[PDB]
Structures are given as structure tokens and as C-alpha cells.
Amino acid sequence: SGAIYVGNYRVVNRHLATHNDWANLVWEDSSRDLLVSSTTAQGCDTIARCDCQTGVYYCSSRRKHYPVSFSKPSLIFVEASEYYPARYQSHLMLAVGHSEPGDCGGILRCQHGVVGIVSTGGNGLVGFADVRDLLWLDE
Ligand SMILES: NC(=O)[C@H]1CCCN(C(=O)[C@@H]2CCc3cccc(O)c32)C1
Numbered sequence: 562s563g564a565i566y567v568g569n570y571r572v573v574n575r576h577l578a579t580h581n582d583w584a585n586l587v588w589e590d591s592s593r594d595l596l597v598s599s600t601t602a603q604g605c606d607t608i609a610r611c612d613c614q615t616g617v618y619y620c621s622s623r624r625k626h627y628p629v630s631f632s633k634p635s636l637i638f639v640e641a642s643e644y645y646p647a648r649y650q651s652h653l654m655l656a657v658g659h660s661e662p663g664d665c666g667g668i669l670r671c672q673h674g675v676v677g678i679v680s681t682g683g684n685g686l687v688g689f690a691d692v693r694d695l696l697w698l699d700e
């Protein structure tokens with residue numbers, strides 16, 4: 562679990578969005594596994610606007626942060642799960658690192674700010690949904 566709180570927005574994994582997220586929906590994209598909902602309180606986070614390919618992410622299944630080298634946002638095949646049929650997920654970045662079910666929502670940051678959130682994993686891999694192209698989060 563986890564979310565990004567920026568301005569009056571809450572960014573979560575679409576597959577983990579709550580009834581309240583859907584009742585305050587701003588934007589969602591199943592192909593990216595993202596959902597943004599509106600908040601009343603002002604957020605605590607700021608978003609990176611950069612091309613970093615190294616950073617640090619939070620891994621809840623280890624209660625620890627790990628450094629990672631990750632690929633540029635791209636269209637990647639993701640096998641069927643209880644949440645989605647087998648499909649291509651867009652704007653996904655892969656890296657070698659630990660992840661398991663429960664770790665979605667962990668934040669990836671570089672020196673400029675938040676880059677994205679954990680969205681996929683498997684056998685020593687971790688995938689992050691990029692949010693750096695969502696310029697409207699800042700306004
Ligand atoms: N974005 C998606 O389509 C997600 C939806 C939830 C299931 N998916 C996974 O990859 C899980 C969650 C992280 C993780 C780590 C290790 C193994 C795994 O199967 C998983 C795919």
C-alpha cells in the first residue's frame with residue numbers, strides 16, 4: 562500500500578483505489594495502473610520533472626529503502642492477475658530489486674522528487690508506474 566500526496570491530489574495504484582478515491586475521481590488509466598483522486602488537505606510530496614534512471618524506493622516487505630537503476634518508461638507485458646487481464650502496461654519502469662504482493666504504492670524518489678510508485682514485481686524485479694509526465698499534478 563501507499564500513495565503520493567501533492568497539492569490537492571492523492572495518487573494511488575488504480576487496483577488499490579478505495580471507494581472514496583473513486584467518489585472523488587480526477588483521472589484514472591487502467592493501462593498505467595494509476596488513479597488520482599481529490600483531497601481537502603494540502604499534500605506533503607513534490608514531483609520530479611527529470612530523466613533520472615537511478616533513485617531509491619521504499620520496500621514495505623523489508624521495511625527498508627533500496628537504491629535502484631531503472632529503465633525508461635515503456636510498454637511492458639504484465640501477466641494476468643486477480644486485478645487485470647494479461648495486457649501491456651504503459652509508462653512502466655523496471656529495476657532489479659525485491660518486491661512482493663503488498664509492496665505496491667511504495668514511492669520511488671530521485672534527487673528531484675517523487676518519480677513514481679511500485680506497481681509490479683517478480684523474481685528479483687520491481688516495476689514502477691511513472692508519474693513525471695503528469696504535469697497537471699503541480700497546478
Ligand atoms: N500492475 C499490475 O498489473 C499489478 C497488479 C497486482 C498484481 N501484480 C503484481 O505484479 C504483483 C504485485 C507486486 C508483485 C511482486 C511480486 C510478484 C507479483 O506477482 C506482484 C501486477
Ligand SMILES: [Zn+2]
Binds near residue numbers: 610613673
Ligand atoms: Zn531526477
